[PDB]
Amino acid sequence: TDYDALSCKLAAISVGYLPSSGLQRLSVDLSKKYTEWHRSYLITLKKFSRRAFGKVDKAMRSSFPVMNYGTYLRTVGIDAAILEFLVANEKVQVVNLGCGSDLRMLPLLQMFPHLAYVDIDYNESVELKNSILRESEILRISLGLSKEDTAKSPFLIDQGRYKLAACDLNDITETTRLLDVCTKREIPTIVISECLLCYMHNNESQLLINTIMSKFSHGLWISYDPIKEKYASRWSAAPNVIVNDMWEIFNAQIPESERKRLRSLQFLDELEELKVMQTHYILMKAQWHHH
Ligand SMILES: Nc1ncnc2c1ncn2[C@@H]1O[C@H](CSCC[C@H](N)C(=O)O)[C@@H](O)[C@H]1O
Question: All domains of the chain, ordered by start, with CATH?
Fold first, then answer.
């Protein structure tokens, strides 16, 4: 089901939905890299695991236009909130909780030179991600890694401004130990729980939100999950909380020439199948400021 995130992302790139140069703000150079980084991740997946390649290859090509619209709003909806925070603050650090197979750090590191980034998943999850980034040549050059495994402890990658690491997020001891050594308190901090909290119980997820919000002074928490007032309540300690289902993001945040561009690639005869599905997915932004 991390494979559902990667299969969706490759189905959107193949049709043309992503990369959107308007919303994500990617040049012709960085849009050529966005497509070549994901496709080099799929080809490298075939080497280390032919079963994992078989699930992602069959799901990508069998994805319908409805499912590709939901992936397009999933990517540019989160990215839009990231770009507002990375322009208002230049020295920023990220903590993508449940990162999985996400490669938004690759374009984000080139655009913002003073951007730290921290990826966190299970031991079985980041072991496969680490092998793919160290094997592919284009993914090696972008992160500035040599083929050697000079990294150390649970830190599978640790080359300057990017750091991959294994950690059970349910175990709060491993999570806070990890954030002490790799991040800083006062530095502005985006936390990204993309399709993560649906796997955890309400006890462990609420402890993860209270502890991470506490350990940083200034920050923004972009979340995304299946199910909106009940979901947004979890971050009530933060004084400013917006919350919106993905049908509301489709109308409000997606501008007019973007609507015509997606219609030109694959026309979605009826917007009803898109509304029913996307009202059951949402997107939460939560900005808190200590001092
Ligand atoms: N307790 C836990 N500790 C660490 N990772 C977890 C976890 N529970 C779920 N995850 C991870 O959360 C991920 C959610 S799948 C979505 C992946 C990513 N957010 C994306 O959109 O591309 C999975 O890869 C899974 O391994």
Answer: 1-291 (3.40.50.150)
